[PDB]
Amino acid sequence: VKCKPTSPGRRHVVKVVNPELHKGKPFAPLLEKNSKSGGRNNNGRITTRHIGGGHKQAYRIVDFKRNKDGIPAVVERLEYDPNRSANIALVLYKDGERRYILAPKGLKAGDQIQSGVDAAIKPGNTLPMRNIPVGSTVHNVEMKPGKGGQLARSAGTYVQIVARDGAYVTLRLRSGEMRKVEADCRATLGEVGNAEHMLRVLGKAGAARWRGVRPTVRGTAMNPVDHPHGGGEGRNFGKHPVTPWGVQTKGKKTRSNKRTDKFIVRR
Amino acid sequence: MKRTFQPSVLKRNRSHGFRARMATKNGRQVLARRRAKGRARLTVSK
RNA sequence: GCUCAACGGAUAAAAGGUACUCCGGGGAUAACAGGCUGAUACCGCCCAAGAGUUCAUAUCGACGGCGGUGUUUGGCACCUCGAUGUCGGCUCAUCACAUCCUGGGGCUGAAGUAGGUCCCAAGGGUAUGGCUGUUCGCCAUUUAAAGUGGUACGCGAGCUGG
RNA sequence: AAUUCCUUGUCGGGUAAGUUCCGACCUGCACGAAUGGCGUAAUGAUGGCCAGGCUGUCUCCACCCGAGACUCAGUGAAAUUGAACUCGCUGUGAAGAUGCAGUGUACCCGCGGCAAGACGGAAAGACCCCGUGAACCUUUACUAUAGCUUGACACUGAACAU
RNA sequence: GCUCGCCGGAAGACCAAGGGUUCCUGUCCAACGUUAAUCGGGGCAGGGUGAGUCGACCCCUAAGGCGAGGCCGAAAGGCGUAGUCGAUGGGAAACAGGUUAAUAUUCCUGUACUUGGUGUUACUGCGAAGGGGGGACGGAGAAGGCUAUGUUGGCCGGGCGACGGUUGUCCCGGUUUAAGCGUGUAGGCUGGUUUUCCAGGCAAAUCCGGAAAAUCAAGGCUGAGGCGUGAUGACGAGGCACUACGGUGCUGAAGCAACAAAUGCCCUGCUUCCAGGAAAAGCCUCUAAGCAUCAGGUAACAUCAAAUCGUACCCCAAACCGACACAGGUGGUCAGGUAGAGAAUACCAAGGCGCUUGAGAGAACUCGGGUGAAGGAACUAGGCAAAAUGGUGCCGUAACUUCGGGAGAAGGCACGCUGAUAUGUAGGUGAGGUCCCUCGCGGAUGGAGCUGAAAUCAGUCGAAGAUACCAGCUGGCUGCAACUGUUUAUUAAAAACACAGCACUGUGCAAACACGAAAGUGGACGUAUACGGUGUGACGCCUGCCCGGUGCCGGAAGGUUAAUU
RNA sequence: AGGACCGAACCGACUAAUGUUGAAAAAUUAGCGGAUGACUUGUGGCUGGGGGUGAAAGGCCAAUCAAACCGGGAGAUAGCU
Ligand SMILES: [Mg+2]
Ligand SMILES: [Mg+2]
Ligand SMILES: [Mg+2]
Ligand SMILES: [Mg+2]
Ligand SMILES: [Mg+2]
Ligand SMILES: [Mg+2]
Ligand SMILES: [Mg+2]
Ligand SMILES: [Mg+2]
Ligand SMILES: [Mg+2]
Ligand SMILES: [Mg+2]
Ligand SMILES: [Mg+2]
Ligand SMILES: [Mg+2]
Ligand SMILES: [Mg+2]
Ligand SMILES: [Mg+2]
Ligand SMILES: [Mg+2]
Ligand SMILES: [Mg+2]
Ligand SMILES: [Mg+2]
Ligand SMILES: [Mg+2]
Ligand SMILES: [Mg+2]
Ligand SMILES: [Mg+2]
Ligand SMILES: [Mg+2]
Ligand SMILES: [Mg+2]
Ligand SMILES: [Mg+2]
Ligand SMILES: [Mg+2]
Ligand SMILES: [Mg+2]
Ligand SMILES: [Mg+2]
Ligand SMILES: [Mg+2]
Ligand SMILES: [Mg+2]
Ligand SMILES: [Mg+2]
Ligand SMILES: [Mg+2]
Ligand SMILES: [Mg+2]
Ligand SMILES: [Mg+2]
Ligand SMILES: [Mg+2]
Ligand SMILES: [Mg+2]
Ligand SMILES: [Mg+2]
Ligand SMILES: [Mg+2]
Ligand SMILES: [Mg+2]
Ligand SMILES: [Mg+2]
Ligand SMILES: [Mg+2]
Ligand SMILES: [Mg+2]
Ligand SMILES: [Mg+2]
Ligand SMILES: [Mg+2]
Ligand SMILES: [Mg+2]
Ligand SMILES: [Mg+2]
Ligand SMILES: [Mg+2]
Ligand SMILES: [Mg+2]
Ligand SMILES: [Mg+2]
Ligand SMILES: [Mg+2]
Ligand SMILES: [Mg+2]
Ligand SMILES: [Mg+2]
Ligand SMILES: [Mg+2]
Distance, in Å, from the CA atom of A69 to the CA atom of A51, rounded to the nearest integer, reads 42
Question: How many helices (H) and strands (E) are present in chain B, helices listed first?
Answer: 1, 0
Ligand 6 center–CA A97 separation, angstroms:
100
Q: Is the CB of A15 under 7 A from strand F?
A: yes
If one counts every other C-beta atom within 10 angstroms of the C-beta of residue A265, the result is 7
Residues of A (210-249) placing their beta carbon closer than 7 angstroms to any atom of strand F are 210, 214-215, 218, 221-226, 231
Experimentally determined by: cryo-EM
Distance, in Å, from the CA atom of A132 to the CA atom of A139, rounded to the nearest integer, reads 11
Contact call for residues A102 and A154 (beta carbons, < 8 A): yes
Distance, in Å, from the CA atom of A50 to the CA atom of A264, rounded to the nearest integer, reads 30
Contact call for residues A193 and A87 (beta carbons, < 8 A): yes
Q: What is the dihedral of CA A240, A244, A245, A250, to 10 degrees?
A: 60
* Residue partners of A249: CB distance under 8 A and separation at least 6: none
Q: After which residues is chain A broken (C to N over 2.5 A)?
A: none
Which residues in A73-205 belong to E strands, given as ranges? 73-74, 92-93
What is the CA angle A59-A60-A66, rounded to 5? 135
Q: Is the CB of A205 under 7 A from strand F?
A: yes
Residues of A (156-195) placing their beta carbon closer than 7 angstroms to any atom of strand F are none
Distance, in Å, from the CA atom of A41 to the CA atom of A47, rounded to the nearest integer, reads 6
Secondary structure of residue B33 in the 3-state scheme: helix
Secondary structure of residue A73 in the 3-state scheme: strand
The single-letter code of the amino acid at A119 is A
- How large is the greatest C-alpha to C-alpha distance in chain A, in angstroms? 72
Chain centroid offset of residue A2 CA: 22
Contact call for residues A81 and A243 (beta carbons, < 8 A): no
Resolution, in Å, please?
9.5
Query: Is A187 exposed, middle or buried, given 0-12, 13-18 or 19+ CB atoms closer than 10 A?
Result: buried
Distance, in Å, from the CA atom of A9 to the CA atom of A31, rounded to the nearest integer, reads 33
- Annotated domain spans of chain B: 1-46
What is the CA angle A24-A79-A126, rounded to 5? 130
Distance, in Å, from the CA atom of A185 to the CA atom of A171, rounded to the nearest integer, reads 12
Q: Which of A192, A155, A196, A197 is nearest to A3 (CA)?
A: A196
Contact call for residues A140 and A173 (beta carbons, < 8 A): no
Per-residue HEC secondary structure of chain A comes to CCCCCCCCCCCCCCCCCCCCCCCCCCCCCCCCCCCCCCCCCCCCCCCCCCCCCCCCCCCCCCCCCCCCECCCEECCCCCCCCCCCCCCCCCEECCCECCCCCCCCCCCCCCCCCECCCCCCCCCCCCEHHHCCCCCCCCCCCCCCCCCCCCCCCCCCCCCCCCCCCCCCCCCCCCCCECCCCCCCECCCCCCCCCCCCCCCCCECECCCCCCCCCCCCCCCCCCCCCCCCCCCCCCCCCCCCCCCCCCCCCCCCCCCCCCCECCCCC
Secondary structure of residue B36 in the 3-state scheme: helix
Distance, in Å, from the CA atom of A162 to the CA atom of A62, rounded to the nearest integer, reads 29
DSSP assignment letter at B28: H
Cis preceding-peptide flag for A5 (omega within 30 of 0) = yes
CA distances to B16, B19, B28, B45 from B10, rounded to whole Å, are 11, 13, 21, 10
In strand D, the nucleotides that come within 7 Å of a protein beta carbon are 35, 136-139, 146, 148-150
If one counts every other C-beta atom within 10 angstroms of the C-beta of residue A151, the result is 21
> Which residues pair with residue A204 across a beta bridge?
A206
Chain centroid offset of residue A229 CA: 34
Secondary structure of residue A33 in the 3-state scheme: coil
CATH number of the structural domain B1-46:
1.10.287.3980
CA distances to A10, A129, A135, B5 from A177, rounded to whole Å, are 37, 19, 17, 59
Which element (helix H / strand E) includes B31? helix B25-31
CA distances to A91, A142, A171, A189, A190 from A136, rounded to whole Å, are 25, 17, 10, 9, 10
Contact call for residues A122 and A139 (beta carbons, < 8 A): no
> Which residues pair with residue A262 across a beta bridge?
A178
* Residue partners of A39: CB distance under 8 A and separation at least 6: A57
Question: How many helices (H) and strands (E) are present in chain A, helices listed first?
Answer: 0, 2
If one counts every other C-beta atom within 10 angstroms of the C-beta of residue A24, the result is 10
Distance, in Å, from the CA atom of A139 to the CA atom of A133, rounded to the nearest integer, reads 13
Distance, in Å, from the CA atom of A159 to the CA atom of A161, rounded to the nearest integer, reads 6
If one counts every other C-beta atom within 10 angstroms of the C-beta of residue A244, the result is 7
Q: What is the dihedral of CA A252, A255, A256, A257, to 10 degrees?
A: 150
Ligand 37 center–CA A232 separation, angstroms:
26
